[PDB]
Amino acid sequence: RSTTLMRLPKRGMQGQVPGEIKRPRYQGVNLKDLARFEGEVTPELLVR
Amino acid sequence: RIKLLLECTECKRRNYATEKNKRNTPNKLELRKYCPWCRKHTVHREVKI
Amino acid sequence: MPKMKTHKGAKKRVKITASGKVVAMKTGKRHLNWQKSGKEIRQKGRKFVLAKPEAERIKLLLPY
RNA sequence: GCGGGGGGAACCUGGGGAACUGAAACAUCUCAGUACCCAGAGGAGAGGAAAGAGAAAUCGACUCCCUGAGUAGCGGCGAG
RNA sequence: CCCGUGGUUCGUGGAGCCAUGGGGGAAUCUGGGCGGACCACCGCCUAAGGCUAAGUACUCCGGGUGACCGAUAGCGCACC
RNA sequence: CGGAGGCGUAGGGAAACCGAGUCCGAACAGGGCGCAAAGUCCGCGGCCGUGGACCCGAAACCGGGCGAGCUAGCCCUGGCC
RNA sequence: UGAAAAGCUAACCGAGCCCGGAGAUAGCUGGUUCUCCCCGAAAUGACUUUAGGGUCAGCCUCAGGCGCUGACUGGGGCCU
RNA sequence: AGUGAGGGCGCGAGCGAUAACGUCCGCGUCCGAGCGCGGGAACAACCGAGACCGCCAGCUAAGGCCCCCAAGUCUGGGCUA
RNA sequence: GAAAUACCACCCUGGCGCGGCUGGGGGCCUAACCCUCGGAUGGGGGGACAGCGCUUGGCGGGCAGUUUGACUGGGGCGGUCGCCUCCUAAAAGGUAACGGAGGCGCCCAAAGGUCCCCUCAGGCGGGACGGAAAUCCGCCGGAGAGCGCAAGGGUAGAAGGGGGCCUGACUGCGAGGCCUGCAAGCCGAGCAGGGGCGAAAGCCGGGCCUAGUGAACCGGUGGUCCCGUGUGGAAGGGCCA
């Protein structure tokens, strides 16, 4: 019951611009190092 | 198909607006008016088959 | 073993906010006939009907 | 002077290959390359060193397990 | 490479690669298919021969274990 | 003990993306929010989806075989009226 | 096959019999099992190749929270 | 989670012949699904009445009291025969 | 004269010259192929045909596999199946019935805007071409004539009759409500851009309103200028109209 406007065509290989929601709040509230953390150091980080 | 055929308005190459219309009485005669999103309002014209 | 949404559904609009809801193009009428015209064409935001949109939901649950 | 042939519960490769039921009808579709007829190598064959992957100036035989998403997608884009 | 078809998550599609039934019909490493229908790029691999081990399958047959069965359940079949 | 993962951990959009903001948009007007009000895992259990899924129940369709001492036919060959 | 009615085709072939898909399919009928305790359904709506079926609406039950909000009654507007 | 069809009675319109234990809709009750007791002879839905279980207890509905069967063959005043 | 004339330019209508492309057809062979010979691997008849391989278009029950609706005081044949209006809905609203009735599946380019004016049929009385009924005069009138189209509502304190000027029958949108379980369909102040009718107090996001209507898929066109399966582009494709 309804046309549509979302079409995901004949394929399988998309690009990227990595949208991982991370929070300066978890960070500074209590799990960080106020200057250098980097994606690399975020394991524990609940944003990966 | 009856004296009722559907046309629509387009404006001086800077847009096109729509709406149906007819055929009967003054047939073709088709300037009209209307305003596109071109500029802020603007003539438009109409015609367009 | 895994069910997986009326993929179809997920596809044809059919969208969810993990909050607890979904929507489809207003889809009230539009993008079809319409020797309609204007003001009428005012209906293309988005929409959602409650109650019913459960089946939708659990069919989907797993991805979309 | 050799060889085969003849078997064999199931597994196995290729050969050829179907309606139901679903799609609450049903003709694309579906079950499916599934059931079954066959030929044949085994003790297991199958595949097995890349005109591959994949895009990072990267990997590196083939096979099987977990994951890869049931997403990427295939479609009277419907059952599936 | 033209159409006639198989594969493949592809059911006809902008639909690629391998694969063949018809007609055409060649290149030796400036070679030639492959990433993007296709065109200009870079990149990739080296095709149209050959051999086999090892890790998943299978259960005739043997051994063993069973919040698996007791004679109308268990294999139907515990014994000419 | 094995730490490829999948679920959380903002999301808003067809996307480009932006980002707790956001798409429409030239519109300061609405809808997805923001709002954590943490889930995530193990179990036990009401419960669907696929699998025959309370149980036995049909006309029949399809595959491979089984039979002319079944029966009718036709062939060969004696006999009897 | 068939001096053909739809005949006979291992004792009832209008499309044989055994095994197989398969435990086909079955909105239709049957059948649907210890005790006791609470509540208490509807047997109507809406569109449906549905119409003895079904999706959503109406009524029910168990759990959270609101917690004086309810049928009905008094009274006073403004509706028939 | 279950019914997705049901009937009866009263009133109000259809219809039908203003016929039917007909069928259409609505207000109510109903009966199923409790509606198992009284009851009217006995009778799912007509008047009474809600049965958690006892009583060799008493008051009552409806509707009853010559008898068959609990209860005045009461009293009072008539009118039919 | 519609044109001017020489001789040099290109371009056509029409027929013949020659040349590259390719379409049509008529003749014994011949060696593949077929039948072949008649007692031999050599002869004979046919022979570029049709046999035959593949692709082409088309006849085509002979065959196959499906389907050929629901309602309805049985089935079928008959009716009928979407929407508006009136009755019965019994006075809120709101409900069957093979219950009564009766319309629509158009359009109106200007019946779409606004400013300015006007104001019925019909009764009567008097009148040229009349002449039951035009056209004009004279009175009278809960407005019963009127409003494309059916009914019903409304309603000339005109939505109705006439003139001027004009496009909003605008995009962006809407708060908050009608009804409805679904989706529907429907009502709308006000903010923005932008105009149009008056000088303006303001009306205009189609009509006087209740019927002229159709999901979803699929695909088209006018965008856009979002995506592109290494990158540039592109087949192709996402949202708009």
- Residue that is written with structure tokens 């399988």 in the block: A12
Decide if A2 touches C, using CB distance below 8 A. yes
What are the C-alpha distances in Å from A43 to residues A25, B27, C18, C23?
Answer: 16, 74, 25, 35
Resolution in A: 4.7
- Answer whether B20 sits within 8 Å of C35, measured CB to CB: yes
As ranges, strand F nucleotides with an atom below 7 A of a protein CB are 7-20, 26, 30-36, 48-50
Helix, coil or strand: residue C32? coil
Determine whether the interchain pair C25/A2 forms a contact, defined as Cβ–Cβ distance below 8 Å: yes
In sequence order, which residues have a C-beta less than 8 Å from that of residue B8 and are 6 or more positions away?
Answer: B16, B17, B18, B19, B20, B21, B48
Cα Rg of chain A, angstroms = 18
Which method was it determined by?
cryo-EM
Q: Which nucleotides of E are covered by protein (CB under 7 A)?
A: 14-15
